[PDB]
Amino acid sequence: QLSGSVGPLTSASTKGATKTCNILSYGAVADNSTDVGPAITSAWAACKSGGLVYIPSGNYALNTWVTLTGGSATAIQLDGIIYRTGTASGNMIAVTDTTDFELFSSTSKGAVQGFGYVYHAEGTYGARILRLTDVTHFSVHDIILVDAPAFHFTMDTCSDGEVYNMAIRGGNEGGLDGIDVWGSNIWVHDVEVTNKDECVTVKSPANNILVESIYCNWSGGCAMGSLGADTDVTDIVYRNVYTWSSNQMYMIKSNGGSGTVSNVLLENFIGHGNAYSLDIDGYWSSMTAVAGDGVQLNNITVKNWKGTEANGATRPPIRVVCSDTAPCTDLTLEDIAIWTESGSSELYLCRSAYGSGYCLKDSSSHTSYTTTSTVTAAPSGYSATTMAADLATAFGLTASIPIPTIPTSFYPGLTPYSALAG
Ligand SMILES: *[C@@H]1O[C@H](CO)[C@@H](O[C@@H]2O[C@H](CO)[C@@H](O[C@@H]3O[C@H](CO[C@@H]4O[C@H](CO)[C@@H](O)[C@H](O)[C@@H]4O)[C@@H](O)[C@H](O[C@H]4O[C@H](CO)[C@@H](O)[C@H](O)[C@@H]4O)[C@@H]3O)[C@H](O)[C@H]2NC(C)=O)[C@H](O)[C@H]1NC(C)=O
Ligand SMILES: *[C@@H]1O[C@H](CO)[C@@H](O[C@@H]2O[C@H](CO)[C@@H](O[C@@H]3O[C@H](CO)[C@@H](O)[C@H](O)[C@@H]3O)[C@H](O)[C@H]2NC(C)=O)[C@H](O)[C@H]1NC(C)=O
Ligand SMILES: *[C@@H]1O[C@H](CO)[C@@H](O)[C@H](O)[C@@H]1O
Ligand SMILES: *[C@@H]1O[C@H](CO)[C@@H](O)[C@H](O)[C@@H]1O
Ligand SMILES: *[C@@H]1O[C@H](CO)[C@@H](O)[C@H](O)[C@@H]1O
Ligand SMILES: *[C@H]1O[C@H](CO)[C@@H](O)[C@H](O)[C@@H]1O
Ligand SMILES: *[C@H]1O[C@H](CO)[C@@H](O)[C@H](O)[C@@H]1O
Ligand SMILES: *[C@H]1O[C@H](CO)[C@@H](O)[C@H](O)[C@@H]1O
Ligand SMILES: *[C@H]1O[C@H](CO)[C@@H](O)[C@H](O)[C@@H]1O
Ligand SMILES: *[C@H]1O[C@H](CO)[C@@H](O)[C@H](O)[C@@H]1O
Ligand SMILES: *[C@H]1O[C@H](CO)[C@@H](O)[C@H](O)[C@@H]1O
Ligand SMILES: *[C@H]1O[C@H](CO)[C@@H](O)[C@H](O)[C@@H]1O
Ligand SMILES: *[C@H]1O[C@H](CO)[C@@H](O)[C@H](O)[C@@H]1O
Ligand SMILES: *[C@H]1O[C@H](CO)[C@@H](O)[C@H](O)[C@@H]1O
Ligand SMILES: *[C@H]1O[C@H](CO)[C@@H](O)[C@H](O)[C@@H]1O
Ligand SMILES: *[C@H]1O[C@H](CO)[C@@H](O)[C@H](O)[C@@H]1O
Ligand SMILES: *[C@H]1O[C@H](CO)[C@@H](O)[C@H](O)[C@@H]1O
Ligand SMILES: *[C@H]1O[C@H](CO)[C@@H](O)[C@H](O)[C@@H]1O
Ligand SMILES: *[C@H]1O[C@H](CO)[C@@H](O)[C@H](O)[C@@H]1O
Ligand SMILES: *[C@H]1O[C@H](CO)[C@@H](O)[C@H](O)[C@H]1O
């Protein structure tokens, strides 16, 4: 949950009035051929303190990556489309050590076409599209990120930020994270993600993060981690998350390590067609083990989950696997009604976890244990609707991905918090 106000300190109109650096004035050519990188860099240099970097409608080729740093009361208005032509590694666009910042499109049509499929068709990965590091008092909204060669959007140690009204659509494989975030006091809402890895995921250290109205439309799903040594994650809320045809509805992953994860609320989730549903995994096999007794998870509430999973017999819809040497404590599982899409039974798995709900123990002696429960009849009230835009098929790995429009519907029965800019 947020600890204070988020977003830029001054409006884009105020910054624009101070000074507008139109990239066409810094050598940019909207010919979908001439490298726009240098122009953005020169425009930033002139407008990074109090001004606004403006990218008018048109098609631009990005051949060399840009690293924009040291801004103060600045903004970038992306009203055109950037196409990746560069082949270097790294981040196509990186904004670092900047305060009072806004990255947006006034038309709700600004986009970055990463052409990640060129790499994926060959079994490889390329640059990430966007990375914000140590950015404070900011907002990123009304933009579209498509087919990143690797990650789409990472917020590395940022704070007092708001991210919303975005569509992120990437390839159908792991390694193509949607939004990865760590820092403090960040509000993410009204975002749709397609890929086969992180939907909106929190990493350590992080405190006071609110994530809601998220539409994981064929994705890896939301998660927390991987968590390792010296973990410190606290006051995290995810609510009103709709997940379709994904790896999971929510996963907390660690494998050894230390530190603590506390005060997490995951409520109002709906899922259909996923591999896993609730998957707390303290022995996540996809990551090499970290020295320590295990990250201590405490006071985690999972409430009001409904829907169906592809196969609840092979993948327990309720899977709570904690460290035997660092038992989960104070977990509250309440009103989780998930049923299986094939078969007539499903399993609930609990390992060394304490609290109240389903297979959890409410004991005093937090010793380890392993238990499996077979449910032979559909939990009452598992029925939940679907979203009209649920993908019938994903975008593969060998053909370009068409640029989507930003939707105005993310979770059943709710409307977006903020109207689209255009
Ligand atoms: C901005 O600039 C970017 C480049 O950075 C443009 O992206 C390229 O767009 C063009 C289309 O305008 C793409 O080329 C066409 O791709 C077609 C599909 O790809 C092929 O698929 C077949 C079958 O799977 C394979 O055999 C090929 O190996 C390719 O993978 C392709 O079929 C087509 O080929 C035919 O092109 C012309 C006209 O169709 C024929 O005359 C020619 O003989 C050939 O047979 C094109 O090559 C190109 O792939 C895109 N680049 C990338 C990286 O995706 C944007 O389109 C530009 N945007 C704007 C708005 O201008
Ligand atoms: C376990 O974790 C939960 C969060 O996951 C903690 O809940 C939070 O507890 C506080 C106090 O009970 C709730 O009250 C809030 O207080 C502030 C300031 O007074 C006020 O601004 C809010 O309007 C609200 O009243 C807070 O809302 C609640 N968080 C959520 C998301 O509901 C809980 O305290 C932890 N329990 C233990 C034993 O540590
Ligand atoms: C259950 O017992 C211990 C924990 O209590 C596990 O380590 C073991 O794998 C079994 O499933
Ligand atoms: C629950 O049962 C499953 C098999 O159905 C085991 O894999 C697990 O360790 C626990 O005993
Ligand atoms: C499956 O259905 C009933 C529902 O009451 C279960 O309680 C029982 O275990 C059976 O095998
Ligand atoms: C760990 O071991 C103790 C004693 O066997 C139990 O009381 C507890 O429920 C858990 O199985
Ligand atoms: C879980 O782990 C404890 C020790 O950490 C054992 O006592 C128990 O038998 C199970 O393996
Ligand atoms: C999980 O389920 C098994 C069998 O129902 C129990 O024996 C165990 O104590 C835990 O409740
Ligand atoms: C298997 O056991 C769990 C508790 O261990 C029940 O919640 C479930 O209904 C099934 O009987
Ligand atoms: C459910 O519980 C056990 C867990 O060991 C399953 O293996 C069995 O099929 C039962 O129905
Ligand atoms: C069956 O029972 C559940 C609570 O366990 C309700 O949520 C549902 O509406 C139905 O009455
Ligand atoms: C699932 O059900 C809801 C109402 O419960 C509809 O609004 C939706 O279109 C879908 O049919
Ligand atoms: C079960 O009930 C829900 C809402 O009550 C529907 O949306 C779903 O399609 C199914 O009929
Ligand atoms: C999800 O699926 C239901 C039917 O199962 C539709 O009513 C809804 O529009 C969406 O396609
Ligand atoms: C690209 O990947 C292969 C061809 O390399 C196709 O099977 C797939 O449908 C996509 O067009
Ligand atoms: C992927 O990208 C290429 C180039 O923009 C298009 O030709 C194709 O239709 C898809 O949008
Ligand atoms: C936003 O706009 C869409 C159409 O793009 C509507 O379907 C939705 O209800 C919301 O008004
Ligand atoms: C988003 O908006 C659509 C209408 O376009 C609803 O059907 C959905 O439940 C959510 O409110
Ligand atoms: C998105 O923006 C609107 C105003 O346009 C706010 O009211 C909302 O809280 C969110 O910041
Ligand atoms: C974006 O807007 C189009 C219509 O303009 C709609 O078809 C899409 O579903 C939405 O994401």
Q: Does the beta carbon of 398 lie inside 6 Å of ligand 15?
A: yes
CATH number at residue 236: 2.160.20.10
Report the half-sphere exposure of 226 (CA within 13 A, side-chain side): 14
Q: Are strands 59-62 and 52-55 parallel, antiparallel or unpaired?
A: unpaired
Q: Tell me the C-alpha distance between 375 and 62, whole Å.
A: 54
Instruction: Pick the atom of ligand 20 nearest to 404's CA.
Output: 11
Cis ω on the peptide bond leading into residue 323 (within 30° of 0)?
no
Helical (H) or strand (E) element with 393 = none
Q: Are 393 and 411 in contact (CB under 8 A)?
A: no
Q: Does the beta carbon of 363 lie inside 6 Å of ligand 8?
A: no
Q: For residue 386, which ligand has an atom nearest its CA?
A: 14
Q: Does the beta carbon of 32 lie inside 6 Å of ligand 16?
A: no
Q: Tell me the C-alpha distance between 328 and 294, whole Å.
A: 10
Enumerate residues 6+ apart whose C-beta is below 8 A from 287.
226, 253, 255
Q: Does the beta carbon of 377 lie inside 6 Å of ligand 11?
A: no
In 4-163, where does DSSP find H-type helix?
12-18, 37-47, 117-120
Q: Are 356 and 332 in contact (CB under 8 A)?
A: yes
Residue 26's SS3 state is helix
Q: Tell me the C-alpha distance between 195 and 174, whole Å.
A: 8
Q: Does the beta carbon of 367 lie inside 6 Å of ligand 3?
A: no
Distance between Cα 370 and ligand 7 center (Å): 10
**283: domain range?**
1-422
Question: Best of 385, 391, 393 to mutate for ligand 14, by most ligand atoms within 8 A of CB?
Answer: 385
Q: Tell me the C-alpha distance between 290 and 362, whole Å.
A: 29
Residue 287's SS3 state is coil
Q: Are 209 and 233 in contact (CB under 8 A)?
A: no
- Residue 48, amino acid: K
Active site residue ranges? 197, 272
In 28-67, where does DSSP find H-type helix?
37-47
Q: For residue 118, which ligand has an atom nearest its CA?
A: 1
Q: Tell me the C-alpha distance between 267 and 275, whole Å.
A: 19
Q: Does the beta carbon of 383 lie inside 6 Å of ligand 11?
A: no
Q: Which of 383, 366, 314 is nearest to 345 (CA)?
A: 314
Distance between Cα 379 and ligand 11 center (Å): 8
| Tokens at 264, concatenated | 């997490």
Burial of 416 (0-12, 13-18, 19+ CB in 10 A): middle
- Diameter of the chain measured on Cα atoms: 70
Q: For residue 370, which ligand has an atom nearest its CA?
A: 3
Atom 7, ligand 11: residue with shortest CA distance: 381
* Experimental technique used to determine this entry: X-ray
Q: Does the beta carbon of 124 lie inside 6 Å of ligand 15?
A: no
Atom 11, ligand 17: residue with shortest CA distance: 408
Cβ neighbour number for residue 294 with a 10 Å cutoff: 25
Q: Tell me the C-alpha distance between 130 and 90, whole Å.
A: 10
**CA pseudo-torsion sign 300, 302, 308, 313:** positive
- Resolution of this entry, Å: 2.0
- With a Cβ cut-off of 6 Å, ligand 12 is lined by 385-386
DSSP state of 248: -
Domain tally, the chain: 1
- With a Cβ cut-off of 6 Å, ligand 4 is lined by 347, 349, 370, 372
Residue 374's SS3 state is strand
Q: Tell me the C-alpha distance between 280 and 222, whole Å.
A: 12
Q: For residue 165, which ligand has an atom nearest its CA?
A: 19
Give the 3-state secondary structure percentages of the chain, helix then strand then coil, rounded to 5: 5, 50, 40
Atom 5, ligand 3: residue with shortest CA distance: 369
Atom 5, ligand 6: residue with shortest CA distance: 367
